[PDB]
């Protein structure tokens, strides 16, 4: 009998329940999460005319820098809350080459420690939600969300998994809105199909809170939407948006636009130009644009990890390039103005 | 309180991999055959062997008895063509949906109900039944849990077009005990499949399950037996001399040989195109194309496909797919004899 010839070992994993006791959610974390969800729901279904904003770092390698970022984001959020509902990006990895993410390599020293990773991720998420800021993250697989789901207001399925049956089944049992990205080829038919699929009940192999594989029956998720993110070209302009709307069946949730990634084509400086174009549409009465996504840090750009380890410029991304804090301020103020102007066209 | 499991109707218990592997024991012939298909696929894709690897059989197995019959014929044809073709039966369990049968694992009674436990039983009993006659099998690797129930029996695993980009499926592949084919993207380009073969070569840590059914961090070695499967897509069919040359142009140093799926995007919404694909491919091969080391074919006892009727399972035509349309046995046997001949020609040219 020949099995496990390419398995080096099975390493012990703390169960979700074990981590949920060890790093407990505060009342404020839990309330913050549920509020982010309600607000998101009202925006994507058209009941609120504010725009949903998912903004923050490409990924979080540094919990302390992330806390200092979050505080600025939260104060900005208090001021702009008439117009914008703000959820911080609390993403753990970048689509894989270079740094393997906070779950895999939380000490940013190219080793593995998935257990300490899940602890860091959970501690992060609690730290952020506890100051009253809702968070969003990528839904990576069927296991890790069980460690974190109590804290999350928004879940994303990346371009690379929108087609994946398992991620569509998973999205169908999650306790929050899920955005599906358009395919890496730059078409959205895959994200429309994901939304439809995810709206139905499925059965997938999940894990229970005690860390055992079990058959998991889902209810279906009515709060999935499509996220425009470019690809093979950019797709944030009015013609692209018109074609996107032409593909959504009646009763669709609103569209979200990502300013980064394929939309900014290899230059983070392009994010504010994406905002200008998206604001012009929203100002002019485009009610189908209900969300945006922005890769923002304290300081702009990105950096490689140098011979010296985790010790690295503070508040600078080690995955995708971000716009810096002051650009983010300008960018978000200008969006809120668009929002108010759309109100008056309406 | 916490707001979790709003959209979870429940959690049902699963027999563990090890429980199932005791309850449906593999025979010494099942285990030898699985090791043998592996060795042979390995030799072909890495160029130690000039036969062609053929993954051939139904789109999906909904009927164990009809597959068993299919298999008896395929094994007799294979005994006869073994100088030229290494044959592995498609023993696939699902098809990519948005209506339709949910597969053998989800819905083993083919009646729009769900019994996952009975389903993994049917799958594993099916793989034992097939491999027990000395026929090796391949299947799609769907997630990180199901393979743990069946991996002892598998010679070939496939990652479909819709998951080739998925990090989790690349990671899985890096720890599987057998060769893995990654299909090119639904857009008809293969960069995503080359990237996946590269990634799967490496060591990864993924969240899998032990043999006793508990989630564990599963550390892998890397899988040096991954290859690319050409299956068409939105750019067009890719089984022609030109497409293969553009394929070859993108393979990195160290890459294993190419497989050509005659079906799916390459049949272009018509199963009767698979013999035509074969001729075009058989022609390249016979004139000296050594970069084509594999083919994939959707084949059943009888041709075509069918919906599931109101009457249910009892209303089904025997030996006819309920998922993608397949060529019939007669036409498969022809396709495979011309294929075997192309391989013979190729030997002469070299
Ligand atoms: N047992 C599988 C490897 C595997 C698959 C899935 C899993 O969760 C763990 C381990 C093999 O020999 O190929
Ligand atoms: N607990 C998740 C649902 C879930 C995710 C993953 C899983 O394996 C089981 C169940 C939620 O509230 O969204
Ligand atoms: Mn990013
Ligand atoms: Mn098929």
XYZ file of C-alpha atoms and ligand atoms in Angstrom:
724
model
C 0.000 0.000 0.000
C 1.621 3.322 -1.164
C 0.437 6.511 0.510
C 2.043 9.602 1.875
C 5.218 9.398 -0.137
C 5.096 13.200 -0.456
C 3.842 14.007 3.009
C 6.685 14.842 5.449
C 4.350 14.879 8.443
C 1.098 15.841 9.965
C 1.674 18.698 12.464
C -0.789 19.384 15.283
C -3.309 22.130 14.893
C -5.101 23.897 17.687
C -8.830 23.551 17.055
C -10.999 26.695 16.258
C -12.755 26.407 19.630
C -9.436 26.212 21.407
C -8.244 29.438 19.772
C -11.614 31.165 20.298
C -11.217 30.570 24.124
C -7.513 31.402 24.143
C -7.983 34.710 22.227
C -11.500 35.680 23.136
C -13.540 38.262 21.261
C -14.551 41.367 23.336
C -18.201 42.573 23.296
C -16.956 45.501 21.213
C -15.254 43.187 18.669
C -18.411 41.152 18.277
C -20.727 44.134 17.974
C -18.347 45.812 15.543
C -18.349 42.738 13.336
C -22.159 42.435 13.262
C -22.557 46.161 12.476
C -20.093 46.019 9.589
C -22.243 43.231 8.131
C -25.603 45.114 8.532
C -24.127 48.213 6.904
C -22.540 46.298 4.052
C -25.822 44.451 3.524
C -27.811 47.715 3.299
C -25.333 49.222 0.835
C -25.008 46.314 -1.650
C -28.726 45.719 -1.733
C -29.461 49.466 -2.311
C -31.151 50.388 0.958
C -28.327 52.823 1.931
C -26.793 55.293 -0.534
C -23.398 55.452 1.115
C -20.569 53.619 -0.509
C -18.907 50.550 1.104
C -15.156 50.961 1.313
C -12.648 48.141 1.971
C -9.403 49.853 2.583
C -6.121 49.063 4.248
C -2.946 47.189 3.621
C -2.345 44.585 0.920
C -1.457 42.296 3.785
C -0.579 42.588 7.456
C 2.950 41.519 8.415
C 3.169 43.887 11.467
C 0.351 43.971 14.058
C 1.640 47.147 15.650
C 1.829 49.152 12.383
C -1.594 47.775 11.600
C -2.993 49.107 14.941
C -1.512 52.562 14.313
C -3.032 52.507 10.755
C -6.313 51.348 12.120
C -6.594 54.237 14.544
C -6.136 56.787 11.772
C -8.690 54.853 9.639
C -11.155 54.791 12.443
C -10.937 58.593 13.128
C -11.258 59.268 9.345
C -14.195 56.864 9.375
C -16.014 58.745 12.142
C -15.827 62.048 10.107
C -16.868 60.433 6.768
C -19.585 58.139 8.072
C -22.447 60.217 6.607
C -21.186 59.194 3.119
C -18.822 56.127 3.392
C -19.058 52.781 5.368
C -15.518 51.742 6.022
C -14.121 48.278 6.542
C -10.400 47.743 6.958
C -8.524 45.285 4.827
C -7.196 42.638 7.210
C -5.667 40.276 4.696
C -3.149 37.715 5.672
C -1.472 36.840 2.391
C -1.026 38.019 -1.178
C -1.733 35.549 -4.029
C 1.627 33.506 -4.285
C 7.875 33.612 -5.222
C 8.100 35.973 -1.989
C 6.640 36.390 1.737
C 4.211 33.504 2.468
C 1.735 35.388 4.716
C 0.880 35.742 8.344
C -0.683 32.301 8.755
C 2.271 30.467 7.252
C 5.218 32.726 8.325
C 4.166 35.048 11.104
C 7.779 35.759 12.154
C 8.529 37.058 8.654
C 11.767 34.894 8.569
C 10.807 32.383 5.927
C 9.936 29.589 8.395
C 6.503 27.943 8.963
C 4.351 28.087 12.112
C 0.712 27.841 11.060
C -0.424 27.616 14.673
C 1.305 30.750 15.754
C 0.042 32.204 12.436
C -3.547 31.496 13.224
C -3.009 33.019 16.686
C -1.435 36.138 15.229
C -4.302 36.419 12.722
C -6.939 36.006 15.372
C -5.154 38.423 17.705
C -4.901 40.913 14.871
C -8.535 40.636 14.034
C -9.579 41.080 17.677
C -7.153 43.993 18.148
C -8.689 45.825 15.138
C -12.333 45.085 15.763
C -11.995 45.988 19.444
C -11.431 49.755 18.613
C -14.732 49.599 16.761
C -13.388 49.155 13.192
C -14.985 46.358 11.001
C -12.617 44.121 9.088
C -12.484 42.222 5.857
C -10.333 39.386 4.671
C -9.868 36.782 1.996
C -11.578 33.416 2.447
C -8.648 31.138 1.690
C -9.975 27.599 2.314
C -12.605 25.793 4.331
C -10.594 25.557 7.525
C -9.023 28.919 8.425
C -12.360 30.872 8.410
C -13.590 28.735 11.292
C -10.886 30.365 13.371
C -11.908 33.892 12.496
C -15.455 34.089 11.256
C -16.926 35.694 14.450
C -14.812 38.770 13.769
C -15.277 39.345 10.032
C -17.708 41.725 8.353
C -16.646 41.067 4.752
C -15.158 38.061 2.960
C -13.407 38.162 -0.459
C -12.779 35.334 -2.927
C -9.728 36.340 -5.083
C -9.574 36.238 -8.840
C -7.715 32.988 -8.652
C -10.484 31.115 -6.819
C -13.792 32.651 -8.171
C -14.042 29.644 -10.453
C -13.377 27.144 -7.675
C -16.377 24.992 -6.695
C -15.176 24.616 -3.135
C -14.804 28.349 -2.555
C -18.276 28.923 -4.078
C -19.739 26.215 -1.625
C -17.874 27.772 1.201
C -19.160 31.293 0.436
C -22.720 29.854 0.583
C -22.281 29.023 4.350
C -20.450 32.162 5.534
C -22.064 34.603 8.004
C -21.360 37.697 5.986
C -21.264 39.244 2.525
C -18.729 37.839 0.097
C -17.278 39.661 -2.886
C -16.163 37.524 -5.845
C -13.454 38.910 -8.053
C -13.591 38.783 -11.792
C -11.281 36.304 -13.423
C -7.613 36.959 -13.998
C -8.392 37.150 -17.776
C -10.524 40.226 -16.926
C -13.944 38.816 -17.589
C -16.753 38.663 -15.097
C -18.989 35.848 -16.236
C -17.034 33.740 -13.618
C -17.963 36.120 -10.807
C -21.625 36.286 -11.881
C -21.743 32.449 -11.908
C -20.063 32.372 -8.471
C -22.702 34.633 -7.027
C -25.496 32.511 -8.384
C -23.931 29.288 -7.170
C -23.173 30.697 -3.776
C -26.858 31.729 -3.337
C -27.883 28.051 -3.030
C -27.431 25.420 -0.307
C -24.462 23.102 -0.729
C -22.678 20.358 1.203
C -18.855 20.669 1.575
C -16.144 19.165 3.765
C -15.534 21.580 6.526
C -14.289 21.342 10.033
C -16.219 21.576 13.289
C -15.165 23.889 16.053
C -13.371 20.949 17.691
C -11.230 20.462 14.568
C -12.883 17.377 13.037
C -13.849 17.031 9.364
C -17.614 16.892 8.967
C -20.238 17.277 6.254
C -21.315 20.894 6.343
C -24.734 21.848 4.933
C -25.202 25.449 4.012
C -28.203 27.746 3.669
C -27.061 29.787 0.645
C -25.779 33.405 0.708
C -27.851 36.270 -0.773
C -25.240 38.850 -0.073
C -22.568 37.973 -2.674
C -21.439 40.461 -5.183
C -18.909 41.007 -7.971
C -15.694 42.942 -7.646
C -14.066 44.565 -10.652
C -10.315 44.289 -10.554
C -8.986 44.398 -14.134
C -6.894 41.799 -15.859
C -6.117 40.678 -19.392
C -7.587 45.361 -19.689
C -8.655 47.717 -16.833
C -12.353 47.737 -16.118
C -13.347 50.728 -13.936
C -14.415 53.063 -16.792
C -18.027 53.814 -17.741
C -18.097 51.536 -20.791
C -16.640 48.606 -18.766
C -19.125 49.316 -15.954
C -21.971 49.423 -18.455
C -20.988 46.005 -19.809
C -20.685 44.643 -16.310
C -24.166 45.830 -15.363
C -25.406 44.256 -18.639
C -24.235 40.859 -17.335
C -25.953 40.986 -13.900
C -29.341 39.286 -13.666
C -32.261 41.139 -12.082
C -32.065 41.189 -8.299
C -28.263 41.493 -8.313
C -26.288 43.138 -5.610
C -24.310 46.239 -6.489
C -20.828 46.146 -7.967
C -17.587 46.873 -6.112
C -14.552 48.268 -7.797
C -10.989 47.529 -6.810
C -8.634 50.492 -7.463
C -5.641 48.256 -7.159
C -4.307 45.145 -8.700
C -5.274 44.725 -12.409
C -7.059 48.121 -12.224
C -3.903 50.070 -11.406
C -1.607 48.035 -13.742
C 1.749 47.646 -11.980
C 1.659 51.162 -10.443
C 0.081 51.948 -7.076
C 0.082 55.665 -8.065
C -2.708 54.804 -10.416
C -5.143 54.210 -7.508
C -6.102 57.897 -7.122
C -6.716 58.081 -10.914
C -9.038 55.093 -10.659
C -10.820 57.007 -7.828
C -11.192 60.168 -10.073
C -12.934 58.055 -12.789
C -15.068 56.185 -10.293
C -16.111 59.408 -8.482
C -17.111 61.070 -11.875
C -19.588 58.142 -12.419
C -20.905 58.093 -8.934
C -21.365 61.966 -8.872
C -23.276 61.696 -12.276
C -25.795 59.279 -10.740
C -24.249 55.776 -11.073
C -26.134 53.897 -8.340
C -24.777 50.427 -9.309
C -21.339 51.295 -7.972
C -21.927 50.501 -4.278
C -18.405 49.575 -3.141
C -14.735 50.166 -3.605
C -11.477 48.528 -2.591
C -8.223 50.286 -1.893
C -4.735 49.133 -0.959
C -3.551 51.791 1.544
C -0.754 51.812 4.179
C 0.892 54.423 6.531
C 3.640 54.892 3.984
C 3.542 54.292 0.319
C 5.055 51.725 -1.974
C 6.455 48.322 -1.018
C 9.819 46.662 -0.079
C 11.535 43.308 -0.284
C 12.633 41.525 2.894
C 16.425 42.251 3.197
C 19.256 39.909 4.508
C 18.538 41.227 8.020
C 15.181 39.586 9.024
C 11.860 41.192 10.159
C 14.209 44.137 11.085
C 12.399 46.637 7.329
C 10.817 50.089 6.927
C 7.936 50.728 9.281
C 4.418 51.048 7.723
C 5.525 49.906 4.315
C 4.022 46.876 2.585
C 6.061 43.720 1.862
C 3.555 42.464 -0.687
C 1.661 44.831 -3.103
C 2.378 48.574 -3.265
C -0.040 50.753 -1.347
C -0.948 54.416 -1.563
C 0.239 56.145 1.632
C -1.874 57.583 4.378
C -2.215 61.183 3.169
C -3.133 60.122 -0.384
C -5.789 57.815 1.187
C -7.258 60.776 3.038
C -7.589 62.835 -0.152
C -8.901 59.793 -2.021
C -11.599 59.077 0.574
C -12.701 62.684 1.110
C -13.159 63.031 -2.664
C -15.264 59.828 -2.683
C -17.465 61.004 0.065
C -18.119 64.258 -1.979
C -19.149 62.072 -4.948
C -21.447 60.215 -2.695
C -23.192 63.454 -1.523
C -23.368 64.757 -5.121
C -24.979 61.425 -6.268
C -27.574 62.001 -3.563
C -28.586 65.331 -5.212
C -28.731 63.771 -8.732
C -30.973 61.127 -7.190
C -23.302 36.957 21.651
C -21.018 35.987 18.697
C -22.765 35.789 15.237
C -21.478 32.584 13.578
C -23.053 29.723 11.569
C -26.032 31.883 10.419
C -25.795 30.000 7.074
C -24.792 26.594 8.366
C -27.804 24.245 8.576
C -25.653 21.698 10.392
C -22.597 19.500 10.734
C -22.947 15.751 9.996
C -20.477 13.083 10.967
C -18.108 11.505 8.558
C -16.440 8.150 8.768
C -12.658 8.730 8.927
C -10.312 7.817 6.088
C -8.870 4.988 8.091
C -12.321 3.583 9.018
C -13.256 3.563 5.386
C -9.943 1.985 4.368
C -10.594 -0.931 6.775
C -14.295 -1.205 5.893
C -13.559 -1.325 2.160
C -10.178 -2.903 2.049
C -8.120 -2.644 -1.051
C -7.060 -6.043 -2.463
C -3.363 -6.855 -3.116
C -4.241 -6.588 -6.821
C -5.829 -3.122 -6.303
C -2.716 -1.855 -4.495
C -0.251 -3.334 -7.073
C -2.171 -1.928 -9.960
C -2.241 1.567 -8.439
C 1.627 1.479 -7.976
C 2.042 0.139 -11.513
C -0.100 2.812 -13.198
C 1.952 5.381 -11.322
C 5.310 3.976 -12.425
C 4.175 3.747 -15.995
C 2.650 7.276 -16.155
C 5.876 8.515 -14.505
C 8.054 6.851 -17.195
C 6.009 8.296 -20.010
C 5.729 11.894 -18.834
C 9.455 12.081 -18.015
C 10.510 10.501 -21.296
C 11.960 7.194 -20.060
C 9.213 5.538 -22.225
C 7.914 6.193 -25.737
C 4.402 4.896 -25.207
C 1.577 7.335 -24.802
C -0.346 7.756 -21.599
C -4.126 7.579 -22.142
C -6.616 8.725 -19.469
C -9.857 7.375 -20.937
C -13.407 6.680 -19.749
C -16.665 8.334 -18.745
C -17.023 12.003 -17.922
C -18.198 10.835 -14.430
C -19.244 7.462 -12.921
C -22.932 7.461 -11.747
C -23.455 3.722 -12.104
C -20.951 1.279 -10.595
C -22.185 -1.720 -12.615
C -21.910 0.034 -15.980
C -18.442 1.263 -15.072
C -17.418 -2.261 -14.160
C -18.527 -3.498 -17.560
C -16.772 -0.573 -19.273
C -13.728 -1.435 -17.345
C -13.653 -5.131 -18.355
C -13.540 -4.100 -22.021
C -10.986 -1.330 -21.493
C -8.761 -3.730 -19.621
C -8.939 -6.320 -22.494
C -8.177 -3.618 -25.141
C -5.342 -2.370 -22.933
C -3.750 -5.929 -22.522
C -3.587 -5.870 -26.340
C -2.290 -2.365 -26.879
C 0.185 -2.353 -23.936
C 3.285 -2.237 -26.244
C 2.098 1.195 -27.440
C -0.336 2.752 -24.849
C -0.392 2.904 -21.049
C -4.066 3.105 -20.193
C -5.665 4.587 -17.106
C -9.464 4.728 -16.759
C -11.276 7.971 -15.905
C -12.980 7.259 -12.643
C -14.263 10.801 -12.045
C -16.819 11.480 -9.410
C -18.308 14.865 -10.368
C -18.661 17.467 -13.057
C -18.242 21.317 -12.638
C -21.821 22.668 -12.185
C -25.032 24.920 -11.987
C -28.012 22.644 -12.288
C -27.452 18.829 -12.726
C -26.414 15.747 -10.744
C -24.108 16.632 -7.858
C -21.837 13.579 -8.288
C -21.209 10.252 -6.719
C -20.009 11.618 -3.419
C -22.843 14.091 -2.876
C -25.696 12.115 -4.459
C -24.717 8.415 -4.885
C -28.400 7.387 -5.338
C -28.723 9.757 -8.304
C -32.106 11.160 -6.971
C -31.252 14.738 -5.899
C -30.705 13.809 -2.266
C -27.523 14.044 -0.201
C -25.660 11.174 1.551
C -21.892 12.024 1.613
C -20.934 8.943 3.739
C -22.630 6.527 1.355
C -21.044 8.530 -1.453
C -17.435 8.137 -0.246
C -18.292 4.460 0.181
C -19.515 4.186 -3.367
C -16.418 6.066 -4.635
C -13.955 3.925 -2.753
C -15.852 0.684 -3.535
C -15.787 1.778 -7.176
C -12.002 2.427 -7.156
C -11.365 -0.976 -5.510
C -13.672 -2.728 -7.991
C -11.851 -1.070 -10.928
C -8.295 -1.505 -9.782
C -8.972 -5.059 -8.562
C -9.124 -6.235 -12.218
C -5.635 -4.753 -12.906
C -6.945 -1.513 -14.484
C -5.378 1.681 -13.063
C -7.572 4.752 -12.437
C -7.444 8.523 -12.394
C -9.723 11.071 -10.842
C -10.048 14.773 -10.160
C -8.609 15.987 -6.828
C -11.471 18.084 -5.515
C -10.397 19.269 -2.141
C -7.976 18.333 0.616
C -10.200 15.907 2.394
C -11.680 13.420 -0.136
C -8.308 12.262 -1.555
C -7.378 11.027 1.869
C -10.138 8.422 1.454
C -9.044 7.141 -1.924
C -5.365 7.933 -2.567
C -4.110 4.433 -2.073
C -5.987 3.427 -5.190
C -5.188 6.290 -7.576
C -2.533 6.393 -10.310
C -3.367 9.771 -11.808
C -4.930 12.906 -10.386
C -6.270 15.830 -12.261
C -6.861 19.470 -11.398
C -9.602 20.890 -13.575
C -9.486 24.164 -15.488
C -11.509 25.850 -12.813
C -9.041 25.033 -10.031
C -5.620 25.226 -11.756
C -5.217 28.709 -10.360
C -6.238 27.735 -6.875
C -3.362 27.904 -4.371
C -4.962 25.279 -2.207
C -5.176 22.777 -5.112
C -1.503 23.510 -6.077
C -0.503 22.828 -2.473
C -2.479 19.624 -2.354
C -0.907 18.447 -5.563
C 2.545 18.989 -4.015
C 1.801 16.193 -1.591
C -0.008 13.580 -3.600
C 1.545 10.185 -4.160
C 1.059 10.259 -7.917
C 1.423 12.313 -11.072
C -0.915 15.343 -11.343
C -2.140 17.032 -14.515
C -3.178 20.657 -14.411
C -5.554 21.760 -17.070
C -5.076 25.033 -18.909
C -7.341 27.938 -18.071
C -10.934 28.307 -19.171
C -9.641 31.184 -21.369
C -7.543 28.681 -23.401
C -4.075 29.780 -22.243
C -1.589 27.724 -20.318
C 0.409 30.125 -18.293
C -1.799 29.281 -15.277
C -1.057 25.530 -15.748
C 2.735 26.036 -16.057
C 2.575 28.228 -12.913
C 0.724 25.436 -11.139
C 3.176 22.753 -12.177
C 6.021 25.090 -10.874
C 4.309 25.733 -7.570
C 3.433 22.089 -6.971
C 7.117 21.139 -7.364
C 7.754 22.860 -4.143
C 7.211 22.083 -0.489
C 3.994 23.541 1.050
C 2.097 23.403 4.362
C -1.643 22.920 3.834
C -4.643 22.232 6.066
C -5.577 18.636 5.438
C -6.984 15.795 7.551
C -5.278 12.875 9.259
C -6.341 9.307 8.667
C -8.366 9.626 11.875
C -10.414 12.613 10.545
C -8.925 15.566 12.339
C -7.597 18.729 10.663
C -3.786 18.846 10.634
C -1.006 20.934 9.065
C 0.148 18.734 6.258
C 3.693 19.340 5.207
C 4.617 18.225 1.644
C 7.817 17.302 -0.362
C 6.908 18.790 -3.739
C 5.593 16.906 -6.752
C 8.037 16.596 -9.616
C 5.527 14.628 -11.722
C 3.154 17.412 -12.647
C 2.259 18.165 -16.186
C 0.065 20.403 -18.331
C -3.150 19.282 -20.020
C -4.289 21.114 -23.085
C -8.122 21.290 -23.243
C -9.085 24.348 -25.249
C -11.023 27.360 -24.052
C -12.094 30.855 -25.000
C -8.903 31.498 -27.165
C -9.873 28.372 -29.197
C -8.962 24.749 -29.545
C -5.228 23.868 -28.737
C -4.549 20.412 -30.012
C -2.985 21.443 -33.400
C 0.707 21.590 -34.435
C 0.707 25.315 -34.046
C -0.831 25.326 -30.530
C 1.552 22.616 -29.284
C 4.531 24.559 -30.604
C 3.334 27.703 -28.768
C 2.801 25.345 -25.735
C 6.369 23.979 -26.019
C 7.675 27.546 -26.303
C 6.349 28.325 -22.784
C 7.512 25.185 -20.890
C 10.349 25.799 -18.425
C 13.509 23.727 -18.186
C 12.621 20.504 -16.416
C 9.028 20.293 -17.641
C 7.402 16.947 -18.174
C 5.525 16.048 -21.311
C 2.152 17.396 -22.558
C -1.272 15.781 -22.508
C -4.012 16.682 -24.920
C -7.582 16.444 -23.862
C -9.653 15.512 -26.917
C -12.796 16.562 -25.096
C -14.134 19.611 -23.259
C -12.932 22.819 -24.975
C -11.144 20.869 -27.649
C -14.329 19.111 -28.862
C -16.099 22.460 -28.987
C -19.562 21.481 -27.871
C -19.639 18.225 -29.893
C -18.446 14.834 -28.679
C -18.244 13.557 -32.308
C -15.202 15.876 -32.734
C -13.036 13.624 -30.498
C -12.102 11.159 -33.345
C -11.126 14.260 -35.368
C -8.956 15.600 -32.612
C -7.316 12.091 -32.464
C -6.392 12.223 -36.193
C -4.816 15.641 -35.859
C -2.903 14.541 -32.824
C -2.052 11.054 -34.200
C -0.605 12.866 -37.203
C 1.806 15.006 -35.146
C 2.838 11.987 -33.141
C 3.507 9.711 -36.140
C 5.653 12.423 -37.853
C 7.931 12.771 -34.772
C 6.269 14.876 -32.022
C 7.788 13.560 -28.772
C 6.407 16.458 -26.654
C 2.940 14.815 -26.726
C 3.159 12.160 -24.141
C -0.470 11.915 -23.097
C -4.060 12.049 -24.181
C -7.418 12.254 -22.426
C -10.695 10.949 -23.879
C -14.333 11.051 -22.712
C -15.749 7.640 -23.478
C -18.549 5.358 -22.300
C -20.269 2.074 -23.319
C -22.751 3.998 -25.401
C -22.338 7.509 -26.831
C -23.880 10.857 -26.169
C -25.363 11.962 -22.871
C -28.786 12.314 -21.127
C -30.638 14.358 -18.553
C -32.043 12.727 -15.420
C -35.835 12.143 -15.993
C -38.781 12.580 -13.455
C -38.979 8.708 -13.328
C -35.555 9.111 -11.662
C -32.504 6.796 -11.899
C -34.702 3.863 -13.065
C -35.487 5.845 -16.259
C -31.828 6.142 -17.319
C -30.413 4.710 -20.534
C -27.706 2.194 -19.594
C -24.064 3.110 -20.212
C -24.878 6.712 -21.147
C -23.324 9.750 -19.359
C -25.439 12.101 -17.237
C -22.773 14.759 -17.474
C -20.664 15.525 -20.643
C -21.272 13.628 -23.843
C -18.802 10.820 -24.556
C -17.938 8.722 -27.586
C -19.182 5.139 -27.541
C -17.138 2.017 -27.058
C -16.905 1.132 -30.766
C -15.491 4.588 -31.632
C -13.082 4.548 -28.634
C -11.621 1.277 -29.710
C -11.002 2.773 -33.165
C -9.533 5.968 -31.802
C -7.214 3.945 -29.557
C -6.041 1.564 -32.301
C -5.120 4.496 -34.595
C -3.448 6.051 -31.565
C -1.472 2.940 -30.892
C -0.416 2.982 -34.582
C 0.774 6.603 -34.397
C 3.002 5.612 -31.472
C 4.409 2.732 -33.556
C 5.191 5.128 -36.406
C 6.856 7.554 -33.981
C 9.257 4.826 -32.843
C 10.368 4.344 -36.470
C 11.044 8.101 -37.073
C 13.253 8.131 -33.899
N -2.674 10.446 1.413
C -2.468 11.221 0.190
C -1.937 12.596 0.595
C -2.908 13.483 1.350
C -4.083 13.927 0.753
C -4.971 14.750 1.419
C -4.663 15.094 2.730
O -5.454 15.802 3.432
C -3.530 14.600 3.322
C -2.639 13.818 2.642
C -1.491 10.542 -0.742
O -0.793 9.541 -0.411
O -1.444 11.022 -1.873
N -18.227 29.604 10.970
C -18.328 30.242 9.653
C -18.897 29.131 8.778
C -17.972 27.960 8.493
C -16.734 28.153 7.798
C -15.872 27.090 7.547
C -16.254 25.795 7.945
O -15.517 24.817 7.786
C -17.427 25.620 8.637
C -18.301 26.689 8.892
C -19.209 31.500 9.652
O -19.881 31.928 10.668
O -19.211 32.173 8.593
Mn -2.763 43.204 -2.943
Mn -16.297 15.967 -18.789
